[PDB]
Design an enzyme around this catalytic site. Structure first.
Site, short mmCIF file in Angstrom:
data_model
loop_
_atom_site.label_atom_id
_atom_site.label_comp_id
_atom_site.label_asym_id
_atom_site.label_seq_id
_atom_site.Cartn_x
_atom_site.Cartn_y
_atom_site.Cartn_z
N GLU A 66 0.76 -1.24 0.00
CA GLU A 66 0.00 0.00 0.00
C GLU A 66 0.81 1.31 0.00
O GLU A 66 0.25 2.36 -0.26
CB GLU A 66 -0.92 -0.03 1.18
CG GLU A 66 -1.72 -1.29 1.12
CD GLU A 66 -2.93 -1.33 2.00
OE1 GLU A 66 -3.39 -0.26 2.45
OE2 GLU A 66 -3.41 -2.45 2.24
N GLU A 75 -1.98 8.98 -0.14
CA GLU A 75 -2.67 8.52 -1.33
C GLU A 75 -2.35 9.44 -2.52
O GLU A 75 -2.30 10.67 -2.37
CB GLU A 75 -4.18 8.45 -1.06
CG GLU A 75 -4.97 8.06 -2.32
CD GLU A 75 -6.48 7.94 -2.08
OE1 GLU A 75 -6.88 7.89 -0.90
OE2 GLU A 75 -7.23 7.85 -3.07
#
Length: 204
Positions: A66, A75
């Site tokens: 991730e 992100e």
């Protein structure tokens, strides 16, 4: 205890592969990781030595997946503010609950609950997950131990694939086999560095 399985050297192996231009590089640190691990009782301290090693490997494989190898804190180009309208966990106007930290904590409801466990205002200062290393790691261990089935899966014979299903079950059953392989590839490599058999139920 966890520092006994995962050393400074093992951690620098994982972290050091990141490009020097990665925002994560020097933010995701062994100190922050150990502090976070010790704050959630049972995390990588449950079961035999092989079980502890497999839980740690499963944690790190998921994280590496991730963050692009401990490269990313934030992100990329989040398409939305990740605000789901709520009376329990109200969104703060102007704030984004886009993914931050080792397991990409996302959404007002999760940041609210995380901040309450950890000790920061998740709703008003979600950015603390991108600015404070120990806080960043605590969100990931918290999610693992208290906000998902990751810990229970890996300590009850569901293996690594069971942690994948706890995190994002849409990937499993050919939902996205690239993403499965990505996580599984990391898991096999961390297992073999730890000298531990990956065990059964590795994939999903």
């Amino acid at each position: 205890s966890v520092g006994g399985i995962i050393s400074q050297s093992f951690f620098n192996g994982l972290a050091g592969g990141a490009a020097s231009s990665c925002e994560g590089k020097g933010f995701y640190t062994y100190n922050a990781f150990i502090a976070a691990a010790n704050a959630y009782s049972g995390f990588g301290t449950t079961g035999s030595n092989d079980v502890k090693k497999r839980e740690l490997a499963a944690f790190f494989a998921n994280v590496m997946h991730e963050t692009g190898g401990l490269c990313y804190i934030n992100e990329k180009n989040p398409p939305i503010n990740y605000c789901q309208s709520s009376s329990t966990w109200p969104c703060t106007s102007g704030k984004s609950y886009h993914g931050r930290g080792p397991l990409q904590l996302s959404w007002n409801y999760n940041y609210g609950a995380a901040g309450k466990s950890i000790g920061f205002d998740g709703l008003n200062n979600p950015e603390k997950v991108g600015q404070d290393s120990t806080i960043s790691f605590k969100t990931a261990v918290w999610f693992w131990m208290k906000n998902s089935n990751c810990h229970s899966a890996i300590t009850s014979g569901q293996g690594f694939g069971g942690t994948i299903k706890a995190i994002n079950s849409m990937e499993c059953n050919g939902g996205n086999s690239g993403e499965v392989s990505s996580r599984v590839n990391y898991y096999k490599k961390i297992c073999s560095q730890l000298g531990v058999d990956p065990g059964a139920n590795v994939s999903c």
